[PDB]
Amino acid sequence: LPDSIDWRENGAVVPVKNQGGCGSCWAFSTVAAVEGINQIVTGDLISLSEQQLVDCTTANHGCRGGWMNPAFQFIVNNGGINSEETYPYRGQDGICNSTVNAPVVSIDSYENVPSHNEQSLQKAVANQPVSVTMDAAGRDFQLYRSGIFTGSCNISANHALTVVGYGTENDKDFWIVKNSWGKNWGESGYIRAERNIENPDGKCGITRFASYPVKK
């Protein structure tokens, strides 16, 4: 496994987005992961539609929450996902528009990363960006500005993000996590959470519900 990796530098990550006042973090995490695997496999970096997922993932609750896997499943069922441009983000629940359906990026499947193991998560991230859930309900996390996050947080899966890499600084390991709260939050929209900590659940429970899309 590489000592460090940054999919942003590898050109597999599109600029940070903003979910706004819509509880669709799960959709943004799913899209980021798919955008990553597509570029890694095809070389083309395309920004995908979170709105389509919000409107079409019937098992999820749109702006009221949802999980990434059901979203991955929709993309599989739909034979792909629309581009961000053809199905723009509205930040609110809407009808799954079949009239505008035109998948540009498709995936074959998706897999879960063996939980409670930062080494396993690292192996997955070394191959592609990984969708994860973290506890972002605390003040420390939400008020994070820069540096390696070592603040106070539990392990509840109340927020979905995308790990786009990992590295080390000042003898402290960290995960490079892409958030969907805009570029004004954290380090230009990213948060470097401490990696290889004591608790098997990882920082803020990052190793609890991690999964990634599979594209042959």
Ligand SMILES: *[C@@H]1O[C@H](CO)[C@@H](O[C@@H]2O[C@H](CO)[C@@H](O)[C@H](O)[C@H]2NC(C)=O)[C@H](O[C@H]2O[C@@H](C)[C@@H](O)[C@@H](O)[C@@H]2O)[C@H]1NC(C)=O
């Ligand atoms: C997330 O919050 C839970 C509470 O739901 C923490 O667990 C409680 O922690 C207190 C001490 O602060 C302990 O006396 C309770 O037994 C424990 N309750 C349950 C149901 O486990 C939990 O903190 C964890 O901290 C470690 C050091 C240890 O005390 C452990 O027992 C405890 O669960 C928080 N979990 C994480 C991963 O941060």
Ligand SMILES: *[C@@H]1O[C@H](CO)[C@@H](O[C@@H]2O[C@H](CO)[C@@H](O)[C@H](O)[C@H]2NC(C)=O)[C@H](O)[C@H]1NC(C)=O
């Ligand atoms: C779904 O997307 C389509 C396309 O953006 C929307 O329908 C078009 O709406 C324009 C403006 O109202 C009309 O001029 C077009 O005739 C419509 N397309 C077609 C093929 O007739 C539609 O409003 C969106 N919403 C829903 C629920 O389908």
